[PDB]
Design an enzyme around this catalytic site. Structure first.
Site, PDB file in Angstrom:
ATOM      1  NE  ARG B  65      -3.616   0.580   2.279  1.00  0.00           N
ATOM      2  CZ  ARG B  65      -3.896   1.141   3.489  1.00  0.00           C
ATOM      3  NH1 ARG B  65      -3.344   0.502   4.500  1.00  0.00           N
ATOM      4  NH2 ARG B  65      -4.680   2.210   3.636  1.00  0.00           N
ATOM      5  CG  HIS B  85       2.671   5.460   6.824  1.00  0.00           C
ATOM      6  ND1 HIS B  85       2.767   5.139   8.179  1.00  0.00           N
ATOM      7  CD2 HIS B  85       1.720   4.623   6.339  1.00  0.00           C
ATOM      8  CE1 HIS B  85       1.937   4.166   8.477  1.00  0.00           C
ATOM      9  NE2 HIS B  85       1.299   3.824   7.379  1.00  0.00           N
TER      10      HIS B  85
HETATM   11  N1  LIG Z   1       0.594   6.786  12.480  1.00  0.00           N
HETATM   12  C1  LIG Z   1      -0.691   6.474  12.516  1.00  0.00           C
HETATM   13  N2  LIG Z   1      -1.164   5.356  11.980  1.00  0.00           N
HETATM   14  C2  LIG Z   1      -2.495   5.248  12.044  1.00  0.00           C
HETATM   15  C3  LIG Z   1      -3.362   6.140  12.648  1.00  0.00           C
HETATM   16  N3  LIG Z   1      -4.684   5.688  12.581  1.00  0.00           N
HETATM   17  C4  LIG Z   1      -4.603   4.544  11.931  1.00  0.00           C
HETATM   18  N4  LIG Z   1      -3.291   4.240  11.579  1.00  0.00           N
HETATM   19  C5  LIG Z   1      -2.915   2.995  10.918  1.00  0.00           C
HETATM   20  O1  LIG Z   1      -2.626   2.091  12.047  1.00  0.00           O
HETATM   21  C6  LIG Z   1      -1.383   1.408  11.825  1.00  0.00           C
HETATM   22  C7  LIG Z   1      -0.818   0.655  13.037  1.00  0.00           C
HETATM   23  O2  LIG Z   1      -0.637   1.578  14.114  1.00  0.00           O
HETATM   24  C8  LIG Z   1      -0.596   2.503  11.082  1.00  0.00           C
HETATM   25  O3  LIG Z   1       0.547   1.897  10.521  1.00  0.00           O
HETATM   26  C9  LIG Z   1      -1.627   2.912  10.041  1.00  0.00           C
HETATM   27  O4  LIG Z   1      -1.819   1.793   9.186  1.00  0.00           O
HETATM   28  P1  LIG Z   1      -2.230   2.171   7.633  1.00  0.00           P
HETATM   29  O5  LIG Z   1      -0.978   2.310   6.876  1.00  0.00           O
HETATM   30  O6  LIG Z   1      -3.108   1.013   7.272  1.00  0.00           O
HETATM   31  O7  LIG Z   1      -3.096   3.480   7.728  1.00  0.00           O
HETATM   32  C10 LIG Z   1      -2.863   7.318  13.303  1.00  0.00           C
HETATM   33  O8  LIG Z   1      -3.615   8.122  13.839  1.00  0.00           O
HETATM   34  N5  LIG Z   1      -1.498   7.388  13.184  1.00  0.00           N
END
Ligand SMILES: Nc1nc2c(ncn2[C@@H]2O[C@H](CO)[C@@H](O)[C@H]2OP(=O)(O)O)c(=O)[nH]1
Ligand SMILES: Nc1nc2c(ncn2[C@@H]2O[C@H](CO)[C@@H](O)[C@H]2OP(=O)(O)O)c(=O)[nH]1
Lengths: 96, 96
Positions: B65, B85
């Site tokens: 992704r 990210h």
């Molecule tokens: N850094 C970050 N990740 C988030 C947040 N909310 C959801 N995520 C998702 O939760 C994961 C595990 O903590 C992150 O790697 C990211 O995965 P995605 O790349 O699928 O969005 C947020 O508020 N901060």
């Protein structure tokens, strides 16, 4: 008792954000920002009710409002920081 | 904080595809599309849980992704782009 002074530059960066909002009178992130702080444990100088107000200092990563707060007094630059939910307070020095 | 406003025309074309999908409610390429973005780091404005949702912005050639995402807020036209990210965000202007 206030535990001494702390330079603004030594606190978490969010402490600077809250001071900026306090200066512009918000808008504040939380509906509890700006409520009167009662100084119920008498850690700060006794004053009439309503002299002190509290504002959230956001803790990035916490799931709640956390324990960092800025309390203002009515004097000029009279801003105290607490990182332990009012157990201890330091007067903020904005010049260092 | 949000880094600034960027014209949709200045972002990778895959951002446009993602916004189009969001407008029609999918279908989306990845199962993770549409999950709640917690705003855990407090980079975006403080809001209730579930105000933000995350959608993948395909990175051409990637097997995963990758790092590009669109974060929507509940307000009319509130959409943010991150190419790192969730390290940084820009508000997307769909009018240019
Ligand atoms: N850094 C970050 N990740 C988030 C947040 N909310 C959801 N995520 C998702 O939760 C994961 C595990 O903590 C992150 O790697 C990211 O995965 P995605 O790349 O699928 O969005 C947020 O508020 N901060
Ligand atoms: N300990 C303490 N809490 C106070 C005082 N005045 C207001 N409060 C608020 O009342 C609550 C009762 O525990 C505290 O969590 C704090 O809410 P905040 O989280 O908004 O700082 C005070 O003088 N002492």
């Amino acid at each position: 008792d206030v535990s001494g002074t702390v330079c603004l530059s030594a606190l978490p960066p969010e402490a600077t954000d809250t001071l900026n909002l306090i200066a512009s009178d918000g808008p504040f992130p939380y509906s509890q920002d700006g409520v009167v702080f009662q100084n119920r444990e008498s850690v700060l100088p006794t004053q009439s009710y309503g002299y002190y107000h509290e504002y959230t200092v956001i803790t990035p990563g916490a799931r709640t409002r956390g324990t960092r707060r800025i309390i203002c007094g009515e004097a000029t630059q009279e801003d105290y920081y607490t990182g332990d939910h009012y157990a201890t307070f330091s007067l903020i020095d904005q010049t260092c």
